Write a structure and sequence with these properties.
part of a larger assembly, 10 chains, A little secondary structure, B mainly alpha, C mainly alpha, D mainly alpha, E mainly alpha, G alpha+beta, H alpha+beta, C: 1 helix, about 0% strand, E: mainly alpha, 2 helices, elongated, binds 2-nonyl-4-hydroxyquinoline N-oxide, Cytochrome b-c1 complex subunit 2, mitochondrial (chain I), Cytochrome b (chains F, J), respiratory chain (chain G), MPP/UQCRC_Complex (chain G), transport (chain G)
Chain lengths: ~55, ~55, ~50, ~100, ~55, ~55, ~450, ~425, ~150, ~55
């Protein structure tokens, strides 16, 4: 069950050609937009989440 | 050194812009005709024969 | 709370063709467009003469 | 190799000497007309080169100004003339043509 | 300079009557002008490149 | 700051004949540019004076 | 070696089955030891009325907080204790509760789903607690400029229609909405022929049915009848909404022209055209060399921090356009370029680029149906919207048809000289005047 | 009625390269070359070289110019993406099958023929600033980055993003050296999804026989302990407290992996109380409002950190950390159930199985395994492995956390965030 | 701050302090970057009423006469309603802060808690510094007595 | 980017009659500004035609 990173927690940066740059390991944030009032930018000096190359018809 | 413009796409480009280029000359002539009341040409138009003979 | 945002009612200025939320504006478009285009078209004709 | 090539070589060493940039300490690449391909190649030059080339042209424009020319000793000796820009210019063009070909398909 | 002189020539011919030498000599100045600007300078320039190894 | 550099008119003049950079290099063959201008206005001037009598 | 074409036929046919109820139970069996089952309902917010609004959203919040049989919190306890993942989303047109779980656990997975979707204990204690939360949600939501701008586009694009409404409603309803209101929405909407049981993983389709029949038998059977209204067409308006706010450091702009709905054949073509324009983000690698003229120009001259085209589908309409973000002094240029690109595609799309877009669409299509969940969610949604489940092979077939002409044609039909729905937020002092954006929706050349 | 699947095939070349593949008859292909060139191999003299490197994946190569790599790939709707961790780098290219031949080429040119031209690299330094900026906008990034810098003195302490003082300063020669140094056969693995073993093998043997870098998966991280604190004003204090755990692969490190799930990791139900969460329940009891906490679990090749990560209002910070801490401390004390460890075990496995449902996910699992183990360990046995965790094993893991030198990183209004000292 | 922090010593001592204490002496002489543009006039107001009061004030005069200062004091410096003591009382702690830099020269300071000012012990320390050595006394010297 | 915004001449025209900001406010009494211009050129035009006979 190696995969240091998807072993959930340590950090894993991802750069791309087509898709957007990522950062994404494990620590909460999650049970946090629940006990609410966690703001966030709306694309303040930034990028864009979910990112693309997923569609349909 | 105009060979930069010599390939498939370029062909498709000029092709797409053909009907437009055509119409723009249709506007262009009728425009000169009517602004100079072209004797030679107008006579053929059915109406617009306001020059009897 | 940006969801309290209402877009003002416009019936007061809307062309008759575009008054019903029930139906497309797709249909009325050609005509509405045609009308205002015919207007300038003729205007140029007028300016031409 | 023999008479034939040294002949063309000296035709050039002549035309070169004839061109006259040398007398203003220039180098053939210093005299190249700057266009896009050129401009980028100049960008791509390393610090030292760039720095050297600006002092060179600067000396020349200074000469050309006061209409003098450099002492004969210091003129630039043909084929002691380093063609410093060419490799870059070549690759800069090389590149453009690729997009150019890519643009036709 | 050929272009210049040819123009000095051209001016001069322009100022002489349409007879004798002047006709044909002018007809040459003419061709030369066009031949020079349209074919002589460009090729002359391409050559200078090949001479520099450019 | 200054005056010559910010006054809407002055700027124009300043960035065209006062500060504007030029080759320390150009020769006499860069005079007929301004000489043409002189000729334009001198034509315009005398030209105007001749017209109040012509 | 097995070709791409060949590979498309390799995908197992999606098994669809109807309950004597109206429940359509569907599956796409595979080899995995894990899977995704859930209920897709044809409930949204375009289905709600000015005052009802926020109902489903309020219901989704209440959904996992206790059933009649599993009270207070055990639902979680059971779901969690078996390492399963319970999830739910809701849009203007669809609502979904789905469970991510170990394959062997398909039974209780389903049992759970049923209980949730049928015996929802909307206890007053909860429904009360829940409003304080949904209020907060709205407060946070207001900070996502993106989230705002898309609601506004919707808000003005659909001026007057139900579609104009947002999913959570205005604070007012979230604060006033009562259990009777909820109960009512559930009963009005949560009924068999409007809901699908979908799955994907290591399961034999037979099992699904057995379960579907076991815990979902008892909806529309003796129900339906009168008081089941259909969906009303929604009038797109073509307007603009600019919420100027120089306090924000970057501007969000989001333009669109009305597009046709889910089932329309000209979406595939619209999507290829889209792929050709593509997206961008400043963390992209390769700037100048991006294929997309927008993306490139953008990246080279820094005309934005990120853009992205799109095509939102609804019943008989949808929004079609792009949305970008950028410095206060770049909204014009950014608009200029995006607009000129659309037209270029309307007037002179070249043959080569259309292949890129078809290729981008296949890579997206295939790449997206990777993993139980997405597939399960594609089954459900597909059934709700297409009536079928359209096999990859067909989409390829559909995409293949499309060529240059097809693009410049379909594009011209939807984008040429049509009035846009404009939505701006942020420091929009420079966002072009509406006439101007409209005048940009066609060009004098052609 | 799907076809019966196939088997992954796995091959160790004598030169050290591992090759593994699977022919899922997928309409698309994924090829990833995994390299032991992660950030831990930088040193006080070239920090960030692996970042700018991660970012330079489409600069010109011999045999593929920037433009072509870009234009080339996009043309087939494919993708090229490189993803680093403190330990590996993973160049992963993806597309439809009919097209692997062209992506595999680009792939190779990038990994084995990079030119790092002066002016292309100069051109890119800025992106280190933009890149990191975009990443560090989640408090967690800095916190974990600091956590690591605090915990180690060695290699694992090096950061995923380039030190600010280094931006604009990493040289092409450094990139050159970094590649020759680490992108070699014995530190490489090549994974194929949707390709066939004879091809990968041929590609490997033809194109990936590179060797003359370093040898081991380490300088060997020296754990140390310590704590880093960032004054911020973010209203919410982010904090992580942690101790040295067990290295990846090893049995102990599954005792820990099981622990995380007892103490609690992510949520499993949209907006839940997290009933089965030892930490979250232990916190609410004493803390009344906005907070999240989760057990934290990193494991590297030759070490690992364990503990928990908390987010709370600037004044409850302490209470949240102190409650969180005691809860672990209470498992160390033996107060661990059994149906509880059982529940954990289930979440873990289901989670793992779940973790590789997808391709992009499976390819990453196989890739890392290749480098961490030189094996491919099937789910059946991973599950069989998770099963072997004894209740006592978990307790012991916790015992270890509770009793061993610690490491804290926290950022926000620290005025009520405890000190370690004070823990 | 920019102008000040251009001597490595500033940051080092600033960090030294932040490391050594958890309390008050750890606070820095220069405003935290995150605070620039964020300190409010009300904070300035409070800071003055809080600390610029008679019991925390002293008034020194060179070239003036005692009756004047006194009068100035009694007329103008009778302010009181802030806090009282010369402390929150610094808690010493220990620890260390490290800055990766690339300055070719490594600046480092290593230190332990000593004696409070005024006290006798603190002159034992003051004497020590001079045994171990402080500044140079001769332009360019070996610092023989160091 | 564009064309209208950077071409030395075009800019001029663009920043004077295309993009240049104006009060959404001004009334009819802001026409005699441009009407004066029309009058200037109409004088200039007919004025010119009268002069080839005068
Ligand atoms: C006394 C009347 C002055 C006539 C024209 C004014 C001079 C401006 C024209 C320029 C323009 C230009 O570019 C140069 C460059 C170098 C030297 C002179 C010069 N001009 O004179
Ligand atoms: C058909 C010939 C046009 C005549 C003049 C061109 C108009 C430009 C003058 C201005 C200037 C100016 O500031 C304003 C402001 C508001 C409205 C009009 C207007 N102009 O027309």
């Amino acid at each position: 069950m190696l995969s240091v990173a998807a072993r959930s927690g340590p950090f894993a940066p991802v750069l791309s050609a087509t898709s957007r740059g990522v950062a994404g390991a494990l620590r909460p944030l999650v049970q946090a937009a629940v006990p609410a009032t966690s703001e966030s930018p709306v694309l303040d000096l930034k990028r864009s989440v979910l990112c693309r190359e997923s569609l349909r018809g | 050194m105009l060979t930069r413009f010599l390939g498939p796409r370029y062909r498709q480009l000029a092709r797409n812009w053909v009907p437009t280029a055509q119409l723009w000359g249709a506007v262009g002539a009728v425009g000169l005709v009517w602004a100079t009341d072209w004797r030679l040409i107008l006579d053929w138009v059915p109406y617009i024969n306001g020059k009897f003979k | 709370s940006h969801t309290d945002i209402k877009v003002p009612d416009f019936s007061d200025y809307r062309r008759p063709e575009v008054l019903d939320s029930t139906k497309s504006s797709k249909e009325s478009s050609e005509a509405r467009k045609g009308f205002s285009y015919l207007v300038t078209a003729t205007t140029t004709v007028g300016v031409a003469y | 190799v023999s008479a034939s090539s040294r002949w063309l070589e000296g035709i050039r060493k002549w035309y070169y000497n004839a061109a006259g940039f040398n007398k203003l300490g220039l180098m053939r690449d210093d005299t190249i007309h700057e266009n896009d391909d050129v401009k980028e190649a100049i960008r791509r030059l390393p610090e030292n080169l760039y720095d050297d080339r600006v002092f060179r042209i600067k000396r020349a424009l200074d000469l050309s100004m006061r209409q003098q020319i450099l002492p004969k000793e210091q003129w630039t000796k043909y084929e002691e003339d380093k063609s410093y820009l060419e490799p870059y210019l070549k690759e800069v063009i090389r590149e453009r043509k690729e997009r150019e070909e890519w643009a036709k398909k | 300079w050929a272009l210049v002189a040819d123009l000095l020539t051209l001016t001069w011919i322009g100022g002489q009557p349409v007879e004798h030498p002047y006709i044909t000599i002018g007809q040459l100045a003419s061709v030369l002008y066009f031949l020079l600007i349209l074919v002589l300078m460009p090729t002359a320039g391409t050559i200078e490149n090949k001479l520099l190894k450019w | 700051t200054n005056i010559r550099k910010s006054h809407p008119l002055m700027k124009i003049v300043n960035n065209a004949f006062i500060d504007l950079p030029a080759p320390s290099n150009i020769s006499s063959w860069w005079n007929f540019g301004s000489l043409l201008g002189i000729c334009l206005i001198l034509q315009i001037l005398t030209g105007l004076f001749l017209a109040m009598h012509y | 070696t097995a070709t791409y074409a060949q590979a498309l036929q390799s995908v197992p046919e999606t098994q669809v089955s109807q309950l004597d109820n109206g429940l359509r139970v569907a599956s796409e069996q595979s080899s995995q030891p894990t899977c995704t089952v859930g209920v897709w309902i044809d409930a949204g917010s375009r289905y709600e009325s000015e005052k009802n609004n926020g109902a489903g959203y309020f219901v989704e919040h209440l959904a996992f907080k206790g059933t009649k049989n599993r009270p207070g919190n055990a639902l979680e306890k059971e779901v969690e204790s078996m390492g399963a993942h319970l999830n739910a989303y809701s849009t203007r047109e669809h609502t979904a509760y789905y469970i991510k779980a170990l394959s062997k656990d398909l039974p209780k997975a389903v049992e759970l789903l049923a209980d949730i979707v049928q015996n929802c204990s909307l206890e007053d204690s909860q429904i009360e607690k829940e409003r304080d939360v949904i209020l907060q949600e709205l407060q946070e939501n207001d900070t996502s400029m993106r989230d705002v701008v898309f609601n506004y586009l919707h808000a003005t694009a659909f001026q007057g229609t139900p579609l104009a409404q947002s999913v959570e409603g205005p604070s007012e309803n979230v604060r006033k909405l009562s259990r009777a209101d909820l109960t009512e929405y559930l009963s009005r909407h949560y009924k068999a022929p409007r809901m699908v049981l979908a799955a994907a993983g290591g399961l034999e389709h037979r099992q699904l049915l057995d379960l579907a029949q076991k815990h979902f038998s008892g909806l529309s059977g003796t129900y339906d009848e009168d008081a089941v209204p259909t969906l009303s067409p929604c009038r797109f308006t073509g307007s603009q909404i600019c919420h100027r706010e120089d306090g924000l450091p970057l501007a969000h702009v989001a333009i669109a022209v009305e597009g046709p709905g889910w089932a329309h054949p000209d979406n595939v073509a619209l999507q290829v055209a889209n792929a050709i324009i593509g997206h961008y983000d400043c963390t992209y690698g390769g700037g100048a060399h991006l294929s997309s003229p927008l993306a490139s120009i953008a990246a080279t001259n820094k005309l934005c921090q990120s853009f992205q085209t799109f095509n939102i589908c609804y019943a008989d309409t949808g929004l079609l356009g792009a949305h970008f973000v950028c410095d206060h002094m770049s909204i014009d240029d950014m608009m200029f370029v995006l607009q000129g690109q659309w037209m270029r595609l309307c007037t002179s799309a070249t043959e080569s680029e259309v292949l890129r877009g078809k290729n981008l669409l296949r890579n997206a299509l295939v790449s997206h149906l990777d993993g139980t969940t997405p597939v399960c969610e594609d089954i459900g949604r597909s059934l709700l919207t297409y009536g079928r489940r359209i096999p990859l092979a067909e989409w390829e077939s559909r995409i293949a048809e499309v060529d240059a002409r097809v693009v410049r044609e379909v594009c011209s039909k939807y984008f040429y000289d049509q009035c846009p729905a404009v939505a701006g937020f942020g420091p929009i002092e420079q966002l072009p005047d509406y006439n101007r954006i409209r005048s940009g929706m066609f060009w004098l050349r052609f | 009625v799907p076809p019966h699947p196939q088997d992954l095939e796995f091959t160790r070349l004598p030169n050290g390269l591992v090759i593994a593949s699977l022919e899922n008859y997928a309409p698309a292909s994924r090829i990833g070359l995994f390299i032991k060139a992660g950030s831990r191999y930088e040193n006080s003299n070239n920090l960030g070289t692996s970042h700018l490197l991660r970012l330079a994946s489409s600069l010109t190569t011999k045999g593929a110019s920037s433009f072509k790599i870009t234009r080339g790939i996009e043309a087939v709707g494919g993708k090229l993406s490189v993803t680093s961790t403190r330990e590996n780098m993973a160049y992963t290219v993806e597309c439809l099958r009919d097209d692997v031949d062209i992506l595999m080429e680009f792939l190779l040119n990038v990994t084995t023929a990079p030119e790092f031209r002066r002016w292309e690299v100069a051109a890119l330094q800025p992106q280190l600033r933009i890149d990191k900026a975009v990443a560090l906008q989640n408090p967690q990034a800095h916190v974990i980055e600091n956590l690591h810098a605090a915990a180690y003195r060695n290699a694992l302490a090096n950061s995923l993003y380039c030190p600010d003082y280094r931006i604009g300063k990493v040289t092409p020669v450094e990139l050159h050296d970094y590649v020759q140094n680490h992108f070699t056969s014995a530190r490489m693995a090549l994974i194929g999804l949707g390709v066939s073993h004879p091809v990968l093998k041929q590609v490997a043997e033809q194109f990936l026989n590179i060797r003359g870098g370093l040898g081991l998966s380490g300088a060997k991280a020296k754990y140390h302990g310590g704590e880093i604190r960032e004054q911020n004003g973010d209203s919410l204090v982010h904090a992580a407290l942690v101790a040295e755990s067990a290295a990846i692969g090893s049995a102990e490190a599954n005792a820990f992996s099981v622990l995380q799930h007892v103490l609690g990791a992510g949520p499993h139900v949209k907006r839940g109380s997290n009933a089965t969460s030892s930490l979250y329940q232990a916190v609410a009891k004493g803390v009344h409002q906005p907070f999240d906490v989760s057990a934290f679990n990193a494991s590297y090749s030759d070490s690992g950190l364990f503990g928990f990560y908390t987010i709370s209002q600037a004044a409850s910070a302490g209470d949240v950390i102190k409650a969180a801490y005691n809860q672990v401390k209470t498992i160390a004390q033996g107060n661990l159930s059994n149906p509880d460890v059982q529940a954990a075990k289930n979440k873990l496995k289901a989670g793992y199985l779940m973790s590789v449902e997808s391709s992009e996910g499976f390819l990453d699992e196989v890739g890392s395994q290749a480098l961490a183990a030189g094996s491919y360990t099937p789910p059946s046995t991973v599950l069989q492995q998770i099963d072997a965790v004894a209740d006592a094993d978990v307790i012991n893991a916790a015992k270890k956390f509770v009793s061993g030198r610690k490491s804290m990183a926290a950022s926000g209004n620290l005025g009520h965030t405890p000190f370690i000292d004070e823990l």
